[PDB]
Design a protein around this ligand. Structure first.
Ligand SMILES: COC(=O)c1cc2c(s1)-c1ccccc1OC2
Ligand SMILES: *[C@@H]1O[C@H](CO)[C@@H](O)[C@H](O)[C@H]1NC(C)=O
Length: 343
């Protein structure tokens, strides 16, 4: 079990001003730290944030969080469930900022909600350094869905933060699961480009600096899209992405005749194309959503290699490897053409 710690700096808050926090299970003797960013969509205006506060309040507030959580999948400490990093120090950072982990705005007389996702990550890292993170060799910032996009937005900032704080020996790496979206046309006619454009202003959202310098003012929304922000990043990032991610299909208004068949096949081909030059990636041809904290995350394989194996091969690559691949993208063109897809 991972134990809840609310942030000691209580000015770093969830949406409603309650303290943000993290769940931690230490593994003394291990110098590996896994910091996982939870996902769960976002909200981009007062009206839809108010609705989320009414019926998805755990994603906006710490008031009702449990004292403990069980680590599952990549957060499991049992080697049978987690062949990759079962002995690591485990951190689960709840998503309570509704801002794709991009915000740096406090609740004030002008703001009903605080959007502090980027500051939550920074403050968790700061407080962990006094709890053993100062001794780390590798900090893997991982996350699923909105948390996977959060990895892409924040991994280089964590790296810069540790450098400026005087810890140049901690290797910061990213694992982005189900957070690699396409700004494509919907199958039938608020879409991700517009949602994030509004969100950035509403959240005071921040993006990685090199990507910001490319797209410039008013165009920072581009940096929320994996294929645009990834080439600007310096930290090693492993990308896990279903080719037919259910959240991608939802925003595309897809829920089979020729037009839809062509749409779905083109979507998979486009996603495959965006991963061609991503050397550490795992992209199975499945219709599904998230993977890495599911207990059966071990079961899916691409080209005969599981994700825990691919991640282990990635670790070795950061010390091509014989029989230990790190770039695993399905080429078959329809959901479940990979027999190991989740049922
Ligand atoms: C559970 O579903 C989610 O959490 C997310 C869905 C989307 C997200 S996150 C998103 C993030 C960056 C750029 C575009 C995006 O389109 C849809
Ligand atoms: C608390 O967090 C805020 C916002 O991130 C920051 O400005 C402030 O310096 C922090 N205070 C302490 C004591 O860490």
């Amino acid at each position: 079990d991972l134990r809840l710690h609310l942030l000691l700096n209580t000015s770093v808050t969830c949406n409603d001003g309650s303290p943000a926090g993290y769940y931690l299970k230490e593994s003394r003797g291990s110098r590996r730290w896994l910091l996982f960013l939870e996902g769960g969509w976002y909200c981009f205006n007062r009206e839809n944030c108010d609705s989320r506060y009414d019926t998805m309040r755990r994603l906006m507030s710490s008031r009702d969080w449990p004292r403990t959580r069980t680590g599952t999948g990549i957060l499991s400490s049992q080697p049978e469930e987690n062949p990759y990093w079962w002995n690591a120090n485990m951190v689960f950072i709840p998503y309570c900022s509704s801002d794709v982990w991009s915000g740096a705005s406090s609740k004030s007389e002008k703001n009903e909600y605080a959007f502090m996702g980027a500051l939550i990550i920074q403050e968790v890292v700061r407080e962990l350094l006094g709890r053993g993170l100062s001794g780390a060799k590798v900090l893997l910032l991982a996350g699923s869905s909105a948390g996977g996009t959060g990895v892409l937005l924040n991994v280089d900032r964590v790296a810069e933060q540790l450098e400026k704080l005087g810890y140049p020996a901690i290797q910061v790496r990213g694992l982005a699961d189900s957070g690699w979206f396409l700004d494509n046309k919907q199958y039938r006619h608020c879409a991700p480009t517009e949602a994030i454009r509004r969100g950035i202003r509403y959240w005071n959202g921040v993006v990685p600096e090199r990507c910001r310098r490319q797209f410039q003012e008013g165009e920072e929304w581009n940096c929320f899209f994996g294929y645009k922000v990834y080439p600007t990043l310096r930290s090693p990032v492993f990308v896990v992405q279903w080719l037919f991610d259910e959240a991608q299909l939802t925003v595309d208004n897809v829920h089979v005749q020729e037009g839809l068949r062509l749409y779905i096949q083109n979507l998979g081909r486009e996603l495959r194309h965006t991963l061609k030059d991503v050397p550490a990636s795992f992209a199975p041809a499945c219709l599904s959503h998230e993977i890495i904290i599911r207990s059966h995350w071990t079961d899916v394989q691409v080209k005969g290699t599981s994700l825990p194996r691919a991640l282990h091969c990635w670790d070795r690559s950061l010390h091509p490897l014989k029989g230990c691949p790190v770039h695993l993208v399905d080429s078959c063109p329809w959901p479940h053409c990979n027999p190991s897809c989740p049922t």
